[PDB]
């Protein structure tokens, strides 16, 4: 597999026998500012959060949180997933996207003596 | 100032003339599993998120997200704030706490004599 | 991608999400002296040039124009494309081919609002 | 002879006993977007290839072809030619020009 | 080829003219705790050994045997095999897998002229 | 291309427009001790030469020739070859095998506008 993008964005890939549950923390991002796309065995994520606005009377004295907004990731899945039958959920800034496996190896397996 | 605690939890301190706005990303943490306590000129927040549950049929293959649950911080504010008149907002795993500065903490402008 | 072609290659690869396009210059080559072959995600091109000759009566000052009696290209496309839906156009010594993406690279991603 | 201009435009000057046939590959340029001028013993070829414009949905991922539009040359012929009795041919982006010697 | 998994599990790949015999040591593993899944030109083994049970009076003073239970591998076969017509044997903690080669994988003989 | 094997066995690949004549010095190898097998776009030849026997009165004092007998080379040709129409020649310890290219001989044709 290969990951590509820009911006701090940890992701967790949970493979299954019928899907590949993927988790990714996206705090501060609205529900609509997420353009999610996918096809075959590759995932295309798009996201963006508004900048840290401050009033003229306010002032930033110490902040370790990044500031860049445009952030995305492009993962190349090993097998194909049914994008048409896929779903996703975004709660508490946590994007949980399900990728049902497509014409995957049936992995029927072999009988062992 | 001095920050102390455990885990991963970036925080941004936005000082103001009448209040101290603070931002902290708490993704995957339930709104109820957040203990907000403070008094005088010190802040302490304790948060915890449920473990990444996976079905027995599932299996993790690649996850960069940390796993430790119990995480908190202990910020030592420079001046005094009005905790009784404070507020907090937890949206998209983004805790926005407002700490109005105390009346005695504001710069007593005696002007020229 | 990887491309080896002995003939001069002033070539382009114009990726279109609805359908991929490709533009290269073969001035002086006839429409019949071109063999277009494509399948899956690979392109095979075979053309000619007929190198210039100098008459004994003529006193050719020089010949800056370079050409190979037999030119060729072998491009490995990144994604699949419909060989049957491909459309070749050879005008002004320029072969402008449009190889639609396999299934028009329509893709499919969740909205999550 | 002397060649002067801009861009990439190989030219082949085929001299003869009664004419000076010249060849020049001009792919992508239209037959009308070629201003051919000549007089005495000097040549001037002014051309321009349309830009590699793409639709808003399209995108360029790999193209070694140049991008400049306006291109021309200025060949100083050795002897005099009959510009009034000159002609040219533009087929397959190949501008085949003939100049009967004076 | 590439092998990937976790734990201790030596494997030996025995190529043949009509099959790809593979050997694998799974000591201490029951016959039922082995899900052997093969399709096309790949292999996977889902194994797990029970924990070393000890009586309350017993104590472990020296053991070089690993402790982790979850163990598996992912072998990438060079050619394709007929998994539907494949077999395997597991005797004395030795997994003997029989992988008949596919019709397209068999190499044709050439007589030396 | 990719060469793989064991021992010392220089090989020279002579590609052609209709075949890929290959040369390989196999001194001391009998004509019968040559296993020629190929299919698609790959070649494998297993050769072996008996050890230099010596009489009890003889003695080896200096020999830079290797000793291992089983030697072979598995080459992955860049294109497909018609193994059914292959030929081989072994003269002066030089195995010359002419393999007619299958893809090159078959060729392809598509309409262009």
Short mmCIF file of N, CA and C in Angstrom, two decimals, chain F residues 10-80:
data_model
loop_
_atom_site.label_atom_id
_atom_site.label_comp_id
_atom_site.label_asym_id
_atom_site.label_seq_id
_atom_site.Cartn_x
_atom_site.Cartn_y
_atom_site.Cartn_z
N UNK F 10 27.70 -16.71 -17.91
CA UNK F 10 27.43 -15.53 -18.73
C UNK F 10 26.47 -15.84 -19.87
N UNK F 11 25.56 -14.90 -20.12
CA UNK F 11 24.56 -15.02 -21.17
C UNK F 11 24.47 -13.71 -21.94
N UNK F 12 24.19 -13.83 -23.24
CA UNK F 12 24.06 -12.68 -24.13
C UNK F 12 22.73 -12.80 -24.84
N UNK F 13 21.91 -11.75 -24.73
CA UNK F 13 20.58 -11.72 -25.33
C UNK F 13 20.65 -10.87 -26.59
N UNK F 14 20.33 -11.47 -27.73
CA UNK F 14 20.34 -10.78 -29.02
C UNK F 14 18.89 -10.67 -29.47
N UNK F 15 18.28 -9.53 -29.20
CA UNK F 15 16.90 -9.30 -29.60
C UNK F 15 16.82 -9.06 -31.10
N UNK F 16 15.70 -9.46 -31.69
CA UNK F 16 15.47 -9.29 -33.11
C UNK F 16 14.04 -8.88 -33.38
N UNK F 17 13.76 -8.61 -34.66
CA UNK F 17 12.43 -8.22 -35.07
C UNK F 17 11.48 -9.40 -35.16
N UNK F 18 12.00 -10.62 -35.11
CA UNK F 18 11.19 -11.83 -35.17
C UNK F 18 11.59 -12.87 -34.15
N UNK F 19 12.67 -12.67 -33.40
CA UNK F 19 13.12 -13.63 -32.40
C UNK F 19 14.13 -12.94 -31.50
N UNK F 20 14.53 -13.65 -30.45
CA UNK F 20 15.50 -13.14 -29.49
C UNK F 20 16.57 -14.21 -29.32
N UNK F 21 17.52 -14.25 -30.25
CA UNK F 21 18.60 -15.22 -30.18
C UNK F 21 19.43 -14.98 -28.93
N UNK F 22 19.63 -16.03 -28.14
CA UNK F 22 20.37 -15.95 -26.89
C UNK F 22 21.59 -16.86 -26.98
N UNK F 23 22.70 -16.39 -26.43
CA UNK F 23 23.96 -17.12 -26.40
C UNK F 23 24.36 -17.36 -24.95
N UNK F 24 24.96 -18.52 -24.69
CA UNK F 24 25.37 -18.87 -23.33
C UNK F 24 26.48 -19.91 -23.40
N UNK F 25 27.63 -19.59 -22.82
CA UNK F 25 28.76 -20.51 -22.80
C UNK F 25 28.56 -21.55 -21.70
N UNK F 26 28.49 -22.81 -22.10
CA UNK F 26 28.29 -23.94 -21.19
C UNK F 26 29.38 -24.97 -21.45
N UNK F 27 30.63 -24.63 -21.16
CA UNK F 27 31.73 -25.57 -21.42
C UNK F 27 31.66 -26.77 -20.50
N UNK F 28 31.98 -27.94 -21.05
CA UNK F 28 31.96 -29.15 -20.28
C UNK F 28 30.59 -29.75 -20.08
N UNK F 29 29.53 -29.02 -20.43
CA UNK F 29 28.17 -29.52 -20.26
C UNK F 29 27.80 -30.38 -21.46
N UNK F 30 27.36 -31.60 -21.19
CA UNK F 30 26.97 -32.49 -22.27
C UNK F 30 25.70 -31.98 -22.94
N UNK F 31 25.48 -32.44 -24.17
CA UNK F 31 24.30 -32.01 -24.91
C UNK F 31 23.04 -32.51 -24.23
N UNK F 32 23.13 -33.64 -23.53
CA UNK F 32 21.98 -34.20 -22.84
C UNK F 32 21.76 -33.57 -21.47
N UNK F 33 22.78 -32.95 -20.89
CA UNK F 33 22.66 -32.32 -19.58
C UNK F 33 22.19 -30.87 -19.71
N UNK F 34 21.17 -30.66 -20.54
CA UNK F 34 20.61 -29.34 -20.77
C UNK F 34 19.09 -29.47 -20.75
N UNK F 35 18.44 -28.77 -19.83
CA UNK F 35 16.99 -28.80 -19.70
C UNK F 35 16.49 -27.45 -20.18
N UNK F 36 15.85 -27.44 -21.35
CA UNK F 36 15.32 -26.23 -21.96
C UNK F 36 13.80 -26.19 -21.79
N UNK F 37 13.32 -25.24 -21.00
CA UNK F 37 11.90 -25.05 -20.77
C UNK F 37 11.57 -23.57 -20.86
N UNK F 38 10.45 -23.26 -21.51
CA UNK F 38 10.05 -21.87 -21.66
C UNK F 38 8.56 -21.82 -21.98
N UNK F 39 7.96 -20.68 -21.65
CA UNK F 39 6.54 -20.45 -21.91
C UNK F 39 6.27 -18.96 -21.73
N UNK F 40 5.51 -18.38 -22.65
CA UNK F 40 5.18 -16.97 -22.58
C UNK F 40 6.38 -16.07 -22.83
N UNK F 41 6.78 -15.32 -21.81
CA UNK F 41 7.90 -14.38 -21.90
C UNK F 41 8.92 -14.64 -20.80
N UNK F 42 9.35 -15.89 -20.67
CA UNK F 42 10.35 -16.22 -19.66
C UNK F 42 11.09 -17.48 -20.09
N UNK F 43 12.36 -17.56 -19.70
CA UNK F 43 13.21 -18.69 -20.05
C UNK F 43 13.95 -19.21 -18.82
N UNK F 44 14.11 -20.53 -18.76
CA UNK F 44 14.83 -21.17 -17.67
C UNK F 44 15.56 -22.38 -18.25
N UNK F 45 16.86 -22.45 -18.00
CA UNK F 45 17.70 -23.53 -18.50
C UNK F 45 18.55 -24.05 -17.35
N UNK F 46 18.38 -25.32 -17.00
CA UNK F 46 19.14 -25.95 -15.94
C UNK F 46 20.19 -26.85 -16.57
N UNK F 47 21.45 -26.52 -16.33
CA UNK F 47 22.60 -27.24 -16.86
C UNK F 47 23.45 -27.77 -15.72
N UNK F 48 24.28 -28.76 -16.05
CA UNK F 48 25.14 -29.38 -15.07
C UNK F 48 26.28 -30.11 -15.76
N UNK F 49 27.49 -29.96 -15.22
CA UNK F 49 28.68 -30.61 -15.74
C UNK F 49 29.31 -31.47 -14.66
N UNK F 50 29.71 -32.68 -15.03
CA UNK F 50 30.29 -33.59 -14.06
C UNK F 50 31.59 -33.02 -13.48
N UNK F 51 31.94 -33.40 -12.26
CA UNK F 51 33.18 -32.89 -11.66
C UNK F 51 34.40 -33.46 -12.37
N UNK F 52 35.44 -32.65 -12.45
CA UNK F 52 36.66 -33.08 -13.11
C UNK F 52 37.30 -34.26 -12.38
N UNK F 53 36.96 -35.47 -12.81
CA UNK F 53 37.52 -36.67 -12.20
C UNK F 53 39.02 -36.71 -12.40
N UNK F 54 39.72 -37.32 -11.45
CA UNK F 54 41.17 -37.43 -11.49
C UNK F 54 41.58 -38.80 -10.98
N UNK F 55 42.62 -39.36 -11.59
CA UNK F 55 43.12 -40.66 -11.17
C UNK F 55 43.77 -40.55 -9.79
N UNK F 56 43.85 -41.69 -9.10
CA UNK F 56 44.44 -41.72 -7.77
C UNK F 56 45.87 -41.21 -7.79
N UNK F 57 46.56 -41.39 -8.92
CA UNK F 57 47.93 -40.91 -9.03
C UNK F 57 47.98 -39.41 -9.28
N UNK F 58 46.89 -38.83 -9.78
CA UNK F 58 46.84 -37.41 -10.05
C UNK F 58 46.64 -36.62 -8.76
N UNK F 59 46.74 -35.30 -8.88
CA UNK F 59 46.57 -34.40 -7.75
C UNK F 59 46.24 -33.03 -8.29
N UNK F 60 45.33 -32.34 -7.61
CA UNK F 60 44.93 -30.99 -8.00
C UNK F 60 45.80 -30.00 -7.23
N UNK F 61 46.53 -29.16 -7.97
CA UNK F 61 47.40 -28.18 -7.36
C UNK F 61 46.94 -26.75 -7.61
N UNK F 62 46.23 -26.49 -8.70
CA UNK F 62 45.77 -25.13 -8.98
C UNK F 62 44.66 -25.16 -10.02
N UNK F 63 43.46 -24.73 -9.62
CA UNK F 63 42.32 -24.73 -10.51
C UNK F 63 41.37 -23.61 -10.11
N UNK F 64 41.19 -22.63 -10.99
CA UNK F 64 40.26 -21.54 -10.73
C UNK F 64 38.85 -21.86 -11.21
N UNK F 65 38.64 -23.03 -11.79
CA UNK F 65 37.30 -23.39 -12.28
C UNK F 65 36.40 -23.69 -11.09
N UNK F 66 35.15 -23.24 -11.09
CA UNK F 66 34.27 -23.55 -9.95
C UNK F 66 34.04 -25.05 -9.84
N UNK F 67 33.38 -25.44 -8.76
CA UNK F 67 33.13 -26.84 -8.46
C UNK F 67 31.66 -27.22 -8.48
N UNK F 68 30.76 -26.31 -8.11
CA UNK F 68 29.34 -26.65 -8.09
C UNK F 68 28.90 -27.09 -9.48
N UNK F 69 28.06 -28.12 -9.51
CA UNK F 69 27.57 -28.68 -10.76
C UNK F 69 26.22 -28.12 -11.17
N UNK F 70 25.22 -28.23 -10.30
CA UNK F 70 23.90 -27.73 -10.64
C UNK F 70 23.95 -26.22 -10.82
N UNK F 71 23.66 -25.76 -12.03
CA UNK F 71 23.66 -24.35 -12.36
C UNK F 71 22.55 -24.08 -13.36
N UNK F 72 21.95 -22.90 -13.25
CA UNK F 72 20.85 -22.54 -14.13
C UNK F 72 20.68 -21.04 -14.11
N UNK F 73 19.86 -20.56 -15.05
CA UNK F 73 19.54 -19.14 -15.15
C UNK F 73 18.09 -19.02 -15.59
N UNK F 74 17.33 -18.22 -14.86
CA UNK F 74 15.92 -17.98 -15.14
C UNK F 74 15.77 -16.54 -15.60
N UNK F 75 15.60 -16.36 -16.90
CA UNK F 75 15.49 -15.04 -17.52
C UNK F 75 14.02 -14.74 -17.78
N UNK F 76 13.64 -13.49 -17.57
CA UNK F 76 12.28 -13.00 -17.80
C UNK F 76 12.36 -12.11 -19.04
N UNK F 77 11.99 -12.68 -20.18
CA UNK F 77 12.07 -11.95 -21.43
C UNK F 77 11.13 -10.74 -21.41
N UNK F 78 11.45 -9.69 -22.17
CA UNK F 78 10.57 -8.51 -22.18
C UNK F 78 9.29 -8.73 -22.96
N UNK F 79 9.26 -9.68 -23.90
CA UNK F 79 8.09 -9.95 -24.71
C UNK F 79 7.83 -11.45 -24.76
N UNK F 80 6.70 -11.81 -25.35
CA UNK F 80 6.31 -13.21 -25.47
C UNK F 80 7.01 -13.85 -26.66
#
